């Protein structure tokens, strides 16, 4: 079980750690976030009181390092960073818990949740998509764009998921444009799977990402690239019959976390009724088109 | 975006564009089999792709034998549609090439995107306006040619003969339009008022009568008013 220390707390600040949350007060005499569970990414997340606009955070992993939290007047956020010094930090959270100043990452026993949400999220992709190499975490924000939102406007601070579009000559073969348009599993099949993810794993680990960031920062183009990637696969009339099973499972526990009342902006009424309703794999997401019946009816 | 009442005079401007109608592509007959269902035979259709400002017709003639063991056939017409549209293109010098095409129905949008992916500068555009190009097989020379194919064909025409000599391409399109609009209304009477004096005569190579520019007057008037009474002839007023 891992620690993420916070040097203090001197603004106020409502703290996200997973899909938990809990309120500090201006200067509350808080150092951080113990028990983390080991072998999972981790997001610990952000959202001042006083500006609720961007909420912000970082991608972490803390078998890759001991790594901490320290507020930044300047630039005016809280900020990771990696402590090398490794006697240094075992000392600091060690004085830290035996004076009770951390909050407990607060698993319930039965509870897959996180598992089920980031099972196929590594670090090492994450690190891809979000590109500051000097740095073993990653930030996202509200804010930060998708490499195809530019397209249509810094790159260092963008989100380099792969582009998806279902109007591009890489969907499209030449002399199969109906074929190709009307049935997507050359493009998810070869152009995605086989050329550019290499295996499932890999394509449910960056959906299951851009979701996250959606939902944890509101990042609109996430938004977009998570329905992008479920109607691809929903769109295509031969998918493996393992990956529909886990399709379904994914979108199952994504449906569940989902706080209630940000359905009307997180949920696309258009993909998510074609999906279940019209695609050629309507009837193969048996979990997820039970949940969303009985938790968003009027989306649908 | 959409073309509209509003940007009507772009369509006579200089940069070249088509129009482009598919409601002849896929065209049927409904009958009863003998065991008292109901089958449908098609019969040879044609797509209408339109220079609206030189007047240049290509009619691509869709010979019943495309649909043979094919299914879906009016989502099919579509991309039939947009392949021969796109092929069109291909075929002419990057000069001739159109720098937009008109599609007369939302529904060819995405086909004639996709089979011009090729073409990212040539613009793909929806209308509003009520255009009445499925009334060109009321044209007898038109629905002749499409008739007898025999195999696929492309046929050439000019369809407004040679008023471009007299008028303009605004006037010789707002003359075809309301032409193309009598004819879609009331098919016979539109065509009594087109041949009823016999000494005006069609030319070999002309698909409309040889009026005198008096004679448009007159004959544009009695295509308003057939319109005009069946504004309520129908809708009773
Ligand atoms: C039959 C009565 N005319 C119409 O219905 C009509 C339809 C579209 C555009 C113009 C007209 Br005048």
Redesign the interface.
């Known amino acids: 079980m891992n620690t993420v220390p916070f040097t203090s707390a001197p603004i106020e600040v409502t703290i996200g750690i997973d899909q938990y949350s809990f309120n500090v007060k201006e200067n509350q005499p808080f150092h951080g976030i113990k028990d983390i569970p080991i072998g999972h990414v981790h997001v610990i997340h952000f959202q001042h009181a006083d500006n609720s606009s961007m909420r912000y955070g970082y991608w972490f992993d803390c078998r890759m390092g001991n790594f901490y939290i320290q507020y930044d007047p300047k630039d005016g956020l809280y900020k990771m960073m990696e402590e090398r010094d490794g006697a240094k930090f075992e000392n600091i959270v060690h004085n830290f818990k035996e004076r009770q100043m951390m909050v407990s990452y607060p698993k319930i026993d039965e509870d897959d949740t996180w598992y089920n949400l980031t099972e196929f999220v590594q670090m090492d992709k994450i690190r891809k998509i979000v590109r500051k190499d000097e740095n073993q975490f990653s930030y996202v924000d509200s804010s930060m764009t998708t490499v195809q939102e530019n397209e249509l406007s810094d790159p260092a601070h963008s989100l380099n998921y792969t582009v998806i579009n279902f109007?591009?000559?890489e969907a499209?073969r030449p002399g199969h444009?109906?074929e190709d348009?009307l049935d997507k599993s050359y493009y998810l099949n070869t152009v995605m799977l086989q050329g550019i993810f290499k295996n499932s794993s890999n394509y449910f680990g960056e959906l299951q990402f851009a979701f996250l960031n959606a939902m944890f920062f509101g990042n609109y183009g996430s938004s977009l690239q998570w329905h992008a990637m479920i109607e691809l696969i929903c769109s295509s009339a031969t998918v493996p019959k393992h990956m529909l099973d886990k399709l379904d499972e994914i979108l199952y526990y994504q449906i569940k976390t989902l706080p209630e009342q940000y359905s009307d902006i997180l949920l696309n009424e258009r993909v998510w009724n074609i999906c279940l309703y019209s695609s050629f794999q309507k009837n193969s997401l048996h979990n997820t088109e039970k949940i969303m019946e009985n938790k968003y009816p009027e989306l649908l | 975006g959409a073309m509209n009442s509003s940007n009507y005079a772009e369509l006579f401007n200089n940069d070249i564009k088509l129009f482009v109608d598919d409601t002849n592509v896929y065209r049927v007959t409904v009958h009863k089999t003998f065991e008292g269902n109901v089958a449908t035979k098609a019969i040879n259709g044609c797509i209408f792709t339109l220079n609206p400002k030189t007047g240049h017709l290509f009619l691509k003639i869709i010979h019943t034998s495309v649909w043979a063991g094919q299914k879906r056939l009016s989502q099919?017409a579509k991309?039939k549609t947009?392949?021969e549209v796109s092929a069109l293109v291909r075929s002419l010098p990057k000069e001739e090439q159109p720098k937009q095409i008109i599609v007369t129905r939302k529904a060819m949008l995405?086909?004639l995107?996709?089979?011009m992916?090729?073409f990212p500068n040539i613009a793909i555009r929806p209308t509003e306006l009520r255009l009445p190009f499925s009334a060109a097989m009321s044209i007898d020379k038109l629905s002749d040619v499409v008739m007898k194919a025999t195999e696929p064909q492309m046929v050439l025409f000019n369809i407004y003969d040679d008023w471009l000599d007299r008028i303009s391409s605004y006037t010789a399109f707002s003359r075809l339009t309301l032409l193309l609009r009598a004819l879609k209304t009331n098919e016979e009477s539109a065509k009594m008022i087109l041949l009823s004096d016999p000494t005006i005569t069609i030319k070999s190579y002309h698909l409309w009568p040889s009026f005198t520019d008096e004679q448009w007057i007159t004959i544009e008037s009695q295509m308003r008013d057939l319109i005009l009474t069946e504004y309520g002839r129908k809708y009773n007023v």
């Open positions: 109007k591009s000559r499209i444009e109906m348009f | 099919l991309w947009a392949e995405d086909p995107e996709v089979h992916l090729d």
